[PDB]
Design a protein around this ligand. Structure first.
Ligand SMILES: C[C@](O)(CS(=O)(=O)c1ccc(F)cc1)C(=O)Nc1ccc(C#N)c(C(F)(F)F)c1
Lengths: 8, 240
C-alpha cells in the first residue's frame, strides 16, 4: 500500500 | 554547479496542513492535523527523492525503505529551516496554517521535542547555514538511516551516500565547517527518534485519545517505525 502507491 | 541546480529545482514548495485555526488548541485537533500534514509531506518527499541525482540506481525496495526510515528526520530538518527563514526561529513553522507557539507546544504534549526542534532551528542562523548547504545536508539525511543488516543492494547505497558527502565538501570549499555541519546533521537523529517513539505510542492508544491517523501513515507507523525502535534500523551517525 505504501508499495502500491509508490510503484503504481 | 550541476548538482545544486538540481537540488534547487526539485525542492518542494509550501505544504499546508488543512488545520482549522478556529477550533481551540486541543491535543486531538493538533495531532490530527500533524498526522495529516505528515502524509501531505510524505507525498512531496517521494516526488523529491525520485528526482534526486542517482536515487533510481537503488533497488526499488531500498528506495521505499530509505524514504520511510528517514521521513521523520527530513521533515524535522526542513521544518527547522522553515522556522528560521520565515519566523527567525521564534515559533515552529510546521506549515503556514499550523504554526506552533509555546502554548501549542504544550497542548501537543510534545514540548521537550518542540524545544529541541527550535534549538535546531536556531542553529541554522547561529552557524549561518547557507541555502545551498541546507539543501545538500537535507539530501544527505535521506541516506542516513539503514537496517543494521544492510539494504537489498547495499553497494549502490554506499556509492550514493559517498557521492552526496563529496557534494557537501565540493560546496564547503573549512575542515571546521565540516565538523560543524556533520554535528548539526547528527543532532537530527535523536529528535527524530523521540518523535518516532511518541508517534508510535500515540498510534497504539489513538482510539482512546480521539487522534486520527491517515491509513498510509498508520501502515508506516506499524510496519516500519518498530524496526527502528526495536534497533533493527539505525542512523548512520558521523560522531560518537
Ligand atoms: C505525529 C506525526 O503526525 C506522525 S506522522 O507524520 O504520521 C509520521 C509517521 C511516520 C514517520 F515515519 C514520520 C512521521 C508527525 O510527526 N507529524 C509531523 C508532521 C509534520 C512535520 C513537519 N514539518 C513534523 C516534524 F517533523 F516537523 F516534526 C511532524
Amino acid at each position: 500500500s505504501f508499495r502500491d502507491w509508490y510503484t503504481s | 554547479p550541476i548538482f545544486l541546480n538540481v537540488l534547487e529545482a526539485i525542492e518542494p514548495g509550501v505544504v499546508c496542513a488543512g488545520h482549522d485555526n478556529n477550533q481551540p488548541d486541543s491535543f486531538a485537533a493538533l495531532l490530527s492535523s500533524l498526522n495529516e500534514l505528515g502524509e501531505r509531506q510524505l507525498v512531496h518527499v517521494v516526488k523529491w527523492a525520485k528526482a534526486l541525482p542517482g536515487f533510481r540506481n537503488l533497488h526499488v525496495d531500498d528506495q521505499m525503505a530509505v524514504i520511510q526510515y528517514s521521513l521523520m528526520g527530513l521533515m524535522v530538518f526542513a521544518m527547522g529551516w522553515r522556522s528560521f527563514t520565515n519566523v527567525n526561529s521564534a515559533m515552529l513553522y510546521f506549515a503556514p496554517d499550523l504554526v506552533f507557539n509555546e502554548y501549542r507546544m504544550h497542548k501537543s504534549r510534545m514540548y521537550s521535542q518542540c524545544v529541541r526542534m527550535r534549538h535546531l532551528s536556531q542553529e541554522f542562523g547561529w552557524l549561518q547555514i547557507t541555502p545551498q548547504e541546507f539543501l545538500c545536508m537535507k539530501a544527505l539525511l535521506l541516506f542516513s538511516i539503514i537496517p543494521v543488516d544492510g539494504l537489498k543492494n547495499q553497494k549502490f547505497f554506499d556509492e550514493l551516500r559517498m557521492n552526496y558527502i563529496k557534494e557537501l565538501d565540493r560546496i564547503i570549499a573549512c575542515s571546521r565547517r565540516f565538523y560543524q555541519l556533520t554535528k548539526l546533521l547528527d543532532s537530527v537523529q535523536p529528535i527524530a527518534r523521540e518523535l518516532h517513539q511518541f508517534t508510535f505510542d500515540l498510534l497504539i492508544k489513538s482510539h482512546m485519545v480521539s487522534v486520527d491517523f491517515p491509513e498510509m501513515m498508520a501502515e508506516i507507523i506499524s510496519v516500519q517505525v518498530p524496526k527502528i525502535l526495536s534497533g533493527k534500523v539505525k542512523p548512520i551517525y558521523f560522531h560518537t
